[PDB]
Each structure stands twice: as C-alpha cells, then as structure tokens.
C-alpha cells in the first residue's frame, strides 16, 4: 500500500516503485530497477511505497548525493524508516568526521593485506567445492557454491563455527530482503545477541580472528567500546554473508546463458579481471540511501529535513548516460563506469575481498567446468531489496566435457 503523498512532494514526480517487490521483477532485477531510467522518468522521483521516499534515478545525482554528507546523512540509510532508524552498524551509520577512525579499524580485518593472507585458502576452497561438483553434472548453484564459498571464507576470517551459518544467514537476509517474519530491529537484536558473548570472550582472551582484532582495537588511539565492537562486527557479518553470495549467482546465471562470453574467457583468461569489473557493473545489486539533514533544494526539487532518499548504487552503471548500451555485457568495455561498491566516504571496505572471490571463482570454475547451462525448463527468479539476489540457479553440464586439474 501507498503512503499518502506529503504536501511538499509534487504530484508529477510520483512514481510508485517498490524496492522490495518491483513490478518488472520477472524480467530480471536489474531490468526491473532500470524502468526508473525509461524516457518518461525524471532524474528524481518520489515513491509512495514502503512509507514514502525519494529515489535518485541517474548516476549523476547518485554520485553527488553520496559525496554530500552534510545534506545526505548515513545516520538513517535503509528504507523503510523503521529499518533506517534501528540501523546502527559502524561505520555505515556514521558520517565524517567521526566515521573515519572506525573505517581504519575495519581495514585491519578486511583490507588488502588481509586478503593477500587469505589468498591460498580462498583458492583451495574454490577448488575443493568445484572439483566435488564437477563429476555430478549438475548443481544448485546458490546453495552448492555461491553461499558456502564466500560464507565459509568469512566464518574462517571471523573465527566462527560453520554450523552457525544457517542461523546467521537467516538473520542477515531479514535485514536486506525480509520475508516478513522479522523486522530489521528484531533481526539486528538477534545478530547482536549472538555477538555479545563472543565479543566479551575475545576481549578477555584475545585471538587473531577478525572479531578479536576489532574487539581489542583502538580508534584514533583510544580503546574501542564493547558496544562499538558489536556494531562493527555486525556489519562485517552482513557484508560477509549477503553480498558476494548474491553477486556470484547473477554472474554465473549470465555465463550459463551466454556461451560466447564463456568462450571469450576460456580462449583468453587474462581478460577475467576486466570481465569481473564489467559483470560488477551489469549485475550491480545494492541499493541503500541517506536521510536529509535539512530542507534542501536539489536539482530543482525541494527536499525536506527528514525525507529519506534511496540512492541505488545499482543504477549508476546501468545509466545510459554513464555507459552506452548499458544492458550489454562487453568485456572489452573501455570505461566501465559504476558505483557498485558505493561512492564517497563509505566506499566498500570489502571490495578487495569481493574481487578476489569473484576472480578466483571465474578462473577456477571455467578451468574445470567450461561448458554448462541452466537446467532445462527452469524459470530463474530474482528477488529485490537492499541487496538483490537470485532465488535458485539449477545448473547442468555433461561430466565428459569437464577437466580435473
């Protein structure tokens, strides 16, 4: 249902897009969001769905807003408003200047040098999973690879038992694509319930896992509090359990449907890093936003203090004003413009981990299973939310065409 239009919002800018269930979802989630960029549609629209909020539809406005933290605060970054208000993860719920000391701590646990440390175990895991699947001639890609591969890497980094995944994965999903059984506040409270005793424990007896590092850490040279450590560790869990997991399934679905693209990467595997970046553009998948700190005129539209504005990271690279023929995947694309990992001071801290996981996946999969397709008859369904994903991805191949390494 539709929230009554506020007096300040002009009627001609109303476009009732539902970020948790977009109209055109059956055509693909990126396609469904791209309807906001059809010729009829202003650069900035108001939807009455999900309590009512602005949506910037073009990369120019999305970038500008993400740069301007004085007008567009990350204190309430999720729609609906109750989710945004409850949202308190660190660093994302904080604006500069105080945000920054916390980013620096987070970088000690997910930064380039840590990923270099993880490199061999990331490869080993990719390979053990793929080799196991290779002979079977089929898989449920979401559950058999996309989920276990990035998630087990995160649980290893965090020093958490793998048997805790189904519970944590359920909770993180309720924050990004809720099935209605939990509010965001409830899911958050449960993630923190899980974390609290582990944080206390690791402050007492420090290990070398990510939770210990964060929990015993300093920010601008003063000790982090247990509450700060919990708000940072929660976010890290979310990043680990619901980002790359979804992205891998979009990419593999595309490769399953497009032999010429796989052929290109089999014939020339040096192109894989560039292909990674182009898939990160075409199959971009995050959309969160900001809250207005004051009344502010933006691109000829009056915004009011407290208005929420969705700034979909997904849309920038799909914008035909950033990338010609945006829905086409071109591994040779000369200037791959996107905001897939965000923009401004909250630029994704996990992006180095994410690119390593994706590139290792592409290399190792195509090396063993170069020819595969979607199970015949399977109608692939996407799902939309703060992070979008794929419900299920049944794949099939002829074992005879595979190669053990």
Ligand X SMILES: CC1(C)[C@@H]2CC[C@@]1(C)C(=O)C2
Residues forming contacts to ligand X in the complex (CB under 6 A) are: 89, 92, 176, 235, 238-239, 243, 286, 288, 386-387
Active site residue 242: yes
Among 91, 234, 312, 389, binds ligand HEM (CB under 6 A): 91
Active site residue 177: yes
For 251-290, what is the HEC assignment?
Answer: HHHHHHHCHHHHHHHHHCHHHHHHHHHHHHHHCCCECEEE
Output the smallest distance, CB 337 to ligand X, in A: 20
Q: Which helix (H) or strand (E) element contains residue 380?
A: none
Residues 357, 359, 360, 364, CA torsion sign: positive
Question: How long, in residues, is the chain?
Answer: 405
- The answer to whether 238 and 175 have CB atoms below 8 angstroms apart is yes
Distances 12 to 9, 15, 41, 292, 301 between C-alpha atoms, Å: 9, 8, 10, 21, 11
48, 58, 103, 177: the active-site residue: 177
Identity of the residue, 139 or 348, whose beta carbon is nearer to ligand X in the bound complex: 348
CA atoms within 13 A on the CB side of 236: 32
Of 178-186, 233-241, 367-375, 397-405, which segment contacts ligand HEM by CB under 6 A?
Answer: 233-241
Instruction: Report residue 366: phi and psi, to 5°.
Output: -70, -25
Distances 79 to 44, 67, 86, 210, 382 between C-alpha atoms, Å: 16, 20, 11, 29, 20
Please state, in angstroms and rounded to a whole number, the distance separating the CA atoms of residues 88 and 76: 8
The verdict on 346 binding ligand HEM (CB under 6 A) reads yes
Among 32, 56, 219, 235, binds ligand HEM (CB under 6 A): 235
The verdict on 350 binding ligand HEM (CB under 6 A) reads yes
- In the bound state, the residue with its beta carbon closest to ligand HEM is 350
Q: Are strands 382-383 and 72-73 parallel, antiparallel or unpaired?
A: unpaired
Active site residue 76: no
The verdict on 30 binding ligand HEM (CB under 6 A) reads no
Among 66, 87, 154, 194, binds K ion (CB under 5 A): 87
Identity of the residue, 15 or 54, whose beta carbon is nearer to K ion in the bound complex: 54
Residue 142 interaction partner, one of ligand HEM, K ion, ligand X, none, beta carbon < 5-8 Å per kind: none
Alpha helical stretches, state H, 159-215: 165-176, 184-204, 210-215
43, 173, 242, 288: the active-site residue: 242
**CA-wise closest residue to 340 among 360, 363, 322, 364:** 322
Of 13-21, 24-32, 103-111, 378-386, which segment contacts ligand HEM by CB under 6 A?
Answer: 103-111
Residue 18 interaction partner, one of K ion, ligand X, ligand HEM, none, beta carbon < 5-8 Å per kind: none
Active site residue 303: no
Please check if 127 is assigned to a binding site: no
Among 141, 149, 250, 341, binds ligand HEM (CB under 6 A): 341
Among 59, 240, 385, 389, binds ligand HEM (CB under 6 A): 240
Identity of the residue, 198 or 387, whose beta carbon is nearer to ligand X in the bound complex: 387
Identity of the residue, 130 or 153, whose beta carbon is nearer to ligand X in the bound complex: 153
Please state, in angstroms and rounded to a whole number, the distance separating the CA atoms of residues 373 and 394: 9
Distances 247 to 30, 121, 142, 250, 301 between C-alpha atoms, Å: 12, 20, 10, 5, 34
Please state, in angstroms and rounded to a whole number, the distance separating the CA atoms of residues 141 and 146: 6
- Which parts are annotated binding residues? 348
- Which parts are annotated binding residues for heme? 348
Enumerate the active-site residues.
177, 242-243, 348-350
Binding site for ligand HEM (CB under 6 A): 74, 77, 91-92, 99, 103, 106, 110, 154, 235-236, 239-240, 243-244, 247, 286, 288, 313, 340-342, 346, 348-350, 353-354
């Amino acid at each position: 249902n539709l929230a009554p239009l506020p007096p300040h919002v002009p009627e001609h800018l109303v476009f009732d897009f539902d970020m948790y269930n977009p109209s055109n979802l059956s055509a693909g989630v990126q396609e469904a969001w791209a309807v906001l960029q059809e010729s009829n549609v202003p650069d900035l629209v108001w939807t009455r769905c999900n309590g009512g909020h602005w949506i910037a539809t073009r990369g120019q406005l999305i970038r500008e807003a993400y740069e301007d933290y004085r007008h567009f605060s990350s204190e309430c970054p999720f729609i609906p408003r109750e989710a945004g208000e409850a949202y308190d993860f660190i660093p994302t719920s904080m604006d500069p200047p105080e945000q920054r000391q916390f980013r620096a701590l987070a970088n000690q646990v997910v930064g380039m040098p840590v990923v270099d440390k993880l490199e061999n175990r990331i490869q080993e895991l990719a390979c053990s999973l793929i080799e196991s699947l290779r002979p079977q001639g089929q898989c449920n890609f979401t559950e058999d690879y996309a989920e276990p591969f990035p998630i087990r890497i995160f649980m290893l980094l965090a020093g958490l038992p793998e048997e805790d995944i189904p519970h944590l994965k359920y909770l993180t999903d309720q924050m990004t694509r809720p099935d209605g059984s939990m509010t965001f506040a409830e899911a958050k409270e449960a993630l923190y319930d899980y974390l609290i005793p582990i944080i206390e424990q690791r402050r007492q007896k420090p290990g070398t896992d990510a939770i210990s590092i964060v929990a015993n850490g300093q920010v601008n040279g003063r000790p982090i509090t247990s509450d700060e450590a919990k708000r940072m560790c929660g976010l890290l869990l979310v990043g680990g359990l619901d980002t790359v997991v979804n992205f891998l399934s979009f990419s593999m679905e595309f490769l399953a449907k497009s032999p010429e693209h796989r052929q290109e990467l089999i014939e020339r595997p040096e192109r894989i890093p560039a292909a990674c970046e182009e898939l990160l553009r075409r199959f971009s998948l995050v959309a969160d936003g900001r809250i207005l700190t004051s009344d502010y005129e933006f691109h000829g539209v009056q915004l009011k203090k407290g208005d929420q504005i969705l700034l979909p990271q997904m849309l920038s690279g799909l914008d035909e004003r950033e990338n010609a023929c945006p829905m086409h995947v071109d591994f040779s694309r000369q200037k791959v413009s996107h905001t897939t990992f965000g923009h401004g001071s909250h630029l994704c801290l996990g992006q180095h981990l994410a690119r390593r996981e994706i590139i290792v996946t592409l290399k190792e999969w195509l090396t063993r299973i170069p020819d595969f397709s979607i199970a015949p008859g399977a109608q692939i369904q996407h799902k939309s939310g703060i992070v979008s994903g794929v419900q299920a991805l049944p794949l099939v191949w002829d074992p005879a065409t595979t190669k053990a390494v």
